[PDB]
Design a protein around this motif. Sequence first.
Motif, short mmCIF file in Angstrom:
data_model
loop_
_atom_site.label_atom_id
_atom_site.label_comp_id
_atom_site.label_asym_id
_atom_site.label_seq_id
_atom_site.Cartn_x
_atom_site.Cartn_y
_atom_site.Cartn_z
N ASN B 21 0.77 -1.30 -0.14
CA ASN B 21 -0.09 0.07 0.06
C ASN B 21 0.78 1.27 -0.09
O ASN B 21 0.84 2.11 1.09
CB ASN B 21 -0.96 -0.32 1.10
CG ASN B 21 -0.27 -0.14 2.50
OD1 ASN B 21 0.90 -0.23 2.63
ND2 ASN B 21 -1.18 -0.28 3.41
N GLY B 23 1.76 4.46 -0.32
CA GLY B 23 1.25 5.53 -0.31
C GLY B 23 -0.28 5.65 -1.10
O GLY B 23 -1.26 5.75 -0.32
N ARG B 84 7.03 4.29 11.31
CA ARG B 84 6.12 4.59 12.19
C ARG B 84 4.83 3.73 12.20
O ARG B 84 4.83 2.67 11.20
CB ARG B 84 5.51 6.14 11.57
CG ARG B 84 4.79 5.99 10.31
CD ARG B 84 4.33 7.76 10.26
NE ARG B 84 3.98 7.60 8.66
CZ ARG B 84 2.58 7.26 8.54
NH1 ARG B 84 1.72 6.72 9.37
NH2 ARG B 84 2.07 7.53 7.29
N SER B 86 0.69 3.53 14.25
CA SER B 86 -0.02 4.36 14.78
C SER B 86 0.42 5.79 15.42
O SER B 86 -0.36 6.68 15.19
CB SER B 86 -0.83 3.61 16.07
OG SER B 86 -1.76 2.64 15.84
N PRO B 88 4.45 7.77 15.31
CA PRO B 88 5.78 7.92 14.92
C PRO B 88 6.77 7.06 15.71
O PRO B 88 6.85 7.19 17.06
CB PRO B 88 6.17 9.22 14.67
CG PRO B 88 5.23 9.97 14.53
CD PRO B 88 4.08 9.32 15.25
N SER B 90 10.55 5.29 17.11
CA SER B 90 11.88 5.77 17.16
C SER B 90 12.79 4.76 16.91
O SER B 90 12.71 3.58 16.99
CB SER B 90 12.28 6.12 18.66
OG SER B 90 11.56 7.03 19.24
N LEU B 91 13.70 5.08 15.75
CA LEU B 91 14.75 4.27 15.28
C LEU B 91 15.61 4.01 16.42
O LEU B 91 15.71 4.50 17.34
CB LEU B 91 15.41 5.17 14.20
CG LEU B 91 16.73 4.39 13.41
CD1 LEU B 91 16.86 4.95 12.28
CD2 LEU B 91 18.10 4.54 14.27
N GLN B 102 11.97 1.34 18.12
CA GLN B 102 11.13 1.36 19.12
C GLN B 102 9.89 1.88 18.77
O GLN B 102 9.66 3.12 18.37
CB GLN B 102 11.58 2.07 20.29
CG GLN B 102 11.03 2.04 21.65
CD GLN B 102 11.63 2.75 22.80
OE1 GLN B 102 12.73 3.30 22.65
NE2 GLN B 102 10.93 2.78 23.94
N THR B 108 -0.83 -1.66 12.07
CA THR B 108 0.00 -1.76 10.96
C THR B 108 1.30 -1.55 11.35
O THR B 108 1.71 -1.16 12.39
CB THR B 108 -0.60 -0.78 9.63
OG1 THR B 108 -0.07 -0.97 8.68
CG2 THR B 108 -0.50 0.74 10.43
N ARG B 139 0.84 -0.19 28.55
CA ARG B 139 1.05 0.17 27.20
C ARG B 139 2.14 0.54 26.76
O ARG B 139 2.35 0.98 25.41
CB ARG B 139 -0.27 0.90 26.62
CG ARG B 139 -1.93 0.29 26.93
CD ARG B 139 -2.68 1.62 26.54
NE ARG B 139 -4.06 1.02 26.66
CZ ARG B 139 -4.77 0.43 25.70
NH1 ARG B 139 -4.41 0.09 24.58
NH2 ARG B 139 -6.03 -0.02 26.11
N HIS B 140 3.26 0.91 27.75
CA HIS B 140 4.27 1.66 27.35
C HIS B 140 5.53 1.13 28.46
O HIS B 140 4.90 1.27 29.68
CB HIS B 140 4.22 2.96 27.30
CG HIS B 140 5.23 3.95 26.80
ND1 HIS B 140 5.62 3.97 25.57
CD2 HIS B 140 5.80 4.59 27.62
CE1 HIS B 140 6.34 4.88 25.58
NE2 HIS B 140 6.75 5.32 26.77
N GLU B 143 9.55 4.89 33.28
CA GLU B 143 10.84 5.47 33.73
C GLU B 143 11.62 4.45 34.63
O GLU B 143 12.96 4.60 34.81
CB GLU B 143 11.05 6.70 33.93
CG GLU B 143 10.35 7.38 35.53
CD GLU B 143 8.88 7.34 34.99
OE1 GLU B 143 8.31 7.01 34.01
OE2 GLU B 143 8.17 8.27 35.80
#
Lengths: 342, 342, 342, 200
Positions: B21, B23, B84, B86, B88, B90-91, B102, B108, B139-140, B143
């Motif tokens: 897909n 683009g 990216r 949902s 963006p 992180s490389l 990350q 997707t 969900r994440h 620290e």
Amino acid sequence: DLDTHFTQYKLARPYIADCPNCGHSRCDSPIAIEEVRGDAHAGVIRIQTSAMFGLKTDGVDLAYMSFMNGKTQKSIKIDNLHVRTSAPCSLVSHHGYYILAQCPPGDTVTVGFHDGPNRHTCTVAHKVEFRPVGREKYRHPPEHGVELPCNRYTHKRADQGHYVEMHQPGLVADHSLLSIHSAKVKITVPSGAQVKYYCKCPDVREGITSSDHTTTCTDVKQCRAYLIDNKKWVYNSGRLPRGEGDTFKGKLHVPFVPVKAKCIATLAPEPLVEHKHRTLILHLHPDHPTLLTTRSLGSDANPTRQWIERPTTVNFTVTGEGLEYTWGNHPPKRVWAQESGE
Amino acid sequence: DLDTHFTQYKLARPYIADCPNCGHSRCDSPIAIEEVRGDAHAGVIRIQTSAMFGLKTDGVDLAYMSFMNGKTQKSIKIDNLHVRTSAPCSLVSHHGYYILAQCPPGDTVTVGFHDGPNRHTCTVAHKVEFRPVGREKYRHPPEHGVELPCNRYTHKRADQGHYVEMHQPGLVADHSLLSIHSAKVKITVPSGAQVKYYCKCPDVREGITSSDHTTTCTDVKQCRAYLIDNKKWVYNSGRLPRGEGDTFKGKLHVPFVPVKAKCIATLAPEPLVEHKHRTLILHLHPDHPTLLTTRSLGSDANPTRQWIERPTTVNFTVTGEGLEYTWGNHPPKRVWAQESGE
Amino acid sequence: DLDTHFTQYKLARPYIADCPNCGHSRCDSPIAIEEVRGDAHAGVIRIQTSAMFGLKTDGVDLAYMSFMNGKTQKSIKIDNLHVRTSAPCSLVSHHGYYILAQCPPGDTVTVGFHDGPNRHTCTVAHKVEFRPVGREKYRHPPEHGVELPCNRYTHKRADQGHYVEMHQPGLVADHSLLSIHSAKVKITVPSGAQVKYYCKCPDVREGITSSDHTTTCTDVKQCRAYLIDNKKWVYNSGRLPRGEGDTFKGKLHVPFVPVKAKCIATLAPEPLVEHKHRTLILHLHPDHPTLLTTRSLGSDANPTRQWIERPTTVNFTVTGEGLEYTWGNHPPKRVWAQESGE
Amino acid sequence: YKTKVPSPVVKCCGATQCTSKPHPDYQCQVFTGVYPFMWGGAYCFCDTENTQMSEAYVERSEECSIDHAKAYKVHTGTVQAMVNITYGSVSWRSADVYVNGETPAKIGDAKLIIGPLSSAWSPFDNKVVVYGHEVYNYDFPEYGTGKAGSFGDLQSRTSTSNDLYANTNLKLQRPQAGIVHTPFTQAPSGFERWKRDKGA
């Protein structure tokens, strides 16, 4: 042949209306979003900006960008368009006031280009979803699967299947006109356009003029800065003030007709068929919520429906004559269950 | 020591395959995404582009960028990579065909750099989640909190723990070759590469040549524009056509092995212990859904399990000998409940 | 009058702290996000960066941008700020360390500008929501509807309603100082600032100096590279090391006070009133989840509450004396239901 | 609340004993075993004697002044009315009156004595919480007591009152892996809930 819809291009202008949450709050953006249509299936939305991108003011290159800045257009490059929703969308094509863009679902719709000095976006509420056509309730179109008759908008412009009324603009405010003649409030004109003028005090009462002065009133804030500039029609936005004179002509097509495309579409993983005595155990394991359903082919139908997203071993009391089985938009199966109890 | 994996670098090329897909729709992107692996815990995905970024064509600087443009590479700077989902991503690091990044959860996966003239991205479906290891279903990653044995991919390249087969490319189409010799269709060659050629008509039937002409056929659209250019092997993508001749060599490592990192990891807020007669009232109030569970240490186990995300006062009939208590990946507690009824 | 809060501007510096998931992982960003406040209603969050944007180092233009690069500021243009969450937010205004921005709901908060050579962002966890005030549970403010007393932050700066303590910075590390004097480790000074110095070995034990050398130790990695540079105070971030000497002065206001704005606010579509005998059938059809509720005005109250998002025909046994009816923040209705049974 | 953390101390080699400052719910806990990365990697040259003293107290939000619940002990008081009488041929008086059965109100020309009414149902209960306009006849726990997370975790007499009661269960934890920050582990307020798990 980008030169077959001068119906709109020559005769329509980039309209400017009141965007509802224009970054900060209600501005007046030229890209003011009306008629959001998240009604198709293919991840696509057809949108109308009040801005008429496409060719320039005159004659060239669909991929340029004419919005209104001032009373005036600005027919320049499209460089950094952004439609977006919950995620950034993908443009599909623009024609006229209207853009098609492949979006994901989103509670809202949020549009915007970048002129270069400023972000200058526009945003709006609209309930969006994308069910693909099929008994699978995906969230997104895959790369593979069966094709089947979805509803979807075209890429193209050579389009007449419908047309929306596009008659004149009403006037618009422009208090940049109402300067001061060193003691009196001084109106001017764009190019000889028709400026409709008077003030709360008694002075000139219509205004169909070149640059007038104002004998009576003095304050800019009590006068009629108007622009009857109906050399180019508009879209008949709800956020338009009526041109009070008349229903002028300007019937103008829509490019992005909804068409009967066969979307590249859904498919659910195959079932695990398991035999029992006049009974289908089916250990089942989908990708997404799949509407399964059956039809016990007796004159007693006894059908069943259940969306299945969680993997589930199910059961079906098959009869003597047969049952059928519909694993999503995967084709319908059928089964002879005569005896097995010896 | 970025100079220890010329196994891949010298010998592999940036492959180009069919993005699903891209683009608009199915293009052929060099960054065509295969083998998405949202199988670790640390917010990380290991991805393979068909493009081989890393060093240049020759010898320098992992942080440069070689994809395929044309038949040719383009070994230039990485300037504006974007993985990216949902949101963006992180490389994390790239090596070879392969990138670690990350990401948050996402239905997707959506990848793309910016060459500079064009966006030129690639996107794909893949179910992604990130459970952290622990009885807390965040969900994440936070620290703070306890460290405990997660599964996760490395930053590094000095890696041999596995290797995937990477033998030759098959041919590829290139109809830029099939020009016209003023009446006949005219094939050429990249650099003396091996062009496999004939047309529907009868003319030259293999094609292992320099620039040939075509005596018989005329139309470009009925001829074999092929590039047997197996000077550099490829990844064995499903979106590769087989090199029909042979299983050439080119066993090549994977950088991003899944390793037993101790993620900085979860922790749920402490409980409110409240006494009763052989009974623990526990007013409880988590941050995220926390799997609580216990073990009544009698030979009657009588355990309990319940994910708790909504704050809840619970109860536990503690016995004489003891119970234990597991507030998420917070360590297990233990309790003497002898009498309290006097 | 951007020149009325030199309390902060002259006397506070752009602080730098430890961002938690700074693109890759925990960096030290100048825009390190503390005190996220998704506590208002208007789609707005007040944030504190550790960076003090606003005027420059000296005196001009709120819309410029001073963060810390090195030990040093960089008071330059704001060109490409980005606050964002689940979606990109909209800036509202900045003053001091502090920015107001209109955001949608989001599990996190994710902030960042673009210096120009680098993205250089900062991100953080914070539970965000935006309930509008009203019995309608929207997800977003509309263009229309009734106004009613929401809680919200101001656009402005001329603000004193609260003030937070802002005393000095503690020291900071800067191992760019600790060069080598060709065999000895060599400290220097910014501008004559106060560098607090010694090494694990025995040498100079305080350090209040110009550029010193180090007689005893040699390794950079065993020395005290410190900057007591308390010419400008800071915000008292949790991610600050204490200035051990004293609670210096520097009481400093907050711009973005929460104020009693009347948000442009919610409204639910009107009900369909239907008569029955002492009974209101109400076919009902909202836009969003609407808390309906009533009060049977007898001394028997018999009220009812239910959030309605799904359209529902409901019922209400109205009594003789009356009932009242509250379709969301639409005003309360009232009803005479005497007989209708003849 | 707002956990307006005072900036922690970091002594580089050896301990820094904390004291119980009189701030409301002044939670402070010394911590060792750090290596605080601050802009130059770490800066304290020791490796276990690196000490970090975290301190955090509870403070009224800025919203506390304006967006704030409000308890009350509610007694009965005295009811009123703007009684219009378009009397007789007088045709008008719209006067504010009382209920206590000896009060006149000579506004207009007539003298009128009202009540006391027999229907002493104060719809307010004894204990009431109040919020902006929505009034809740809630058994608020009390000043000085409210369990953390529950309603009234913060309990200030008024907005000006610097003293308060902050049972928030504020528990500091040590910062991770030698980095400067302040883990404050705390219940979000019983004013946060009470706005979306409240009563009607």
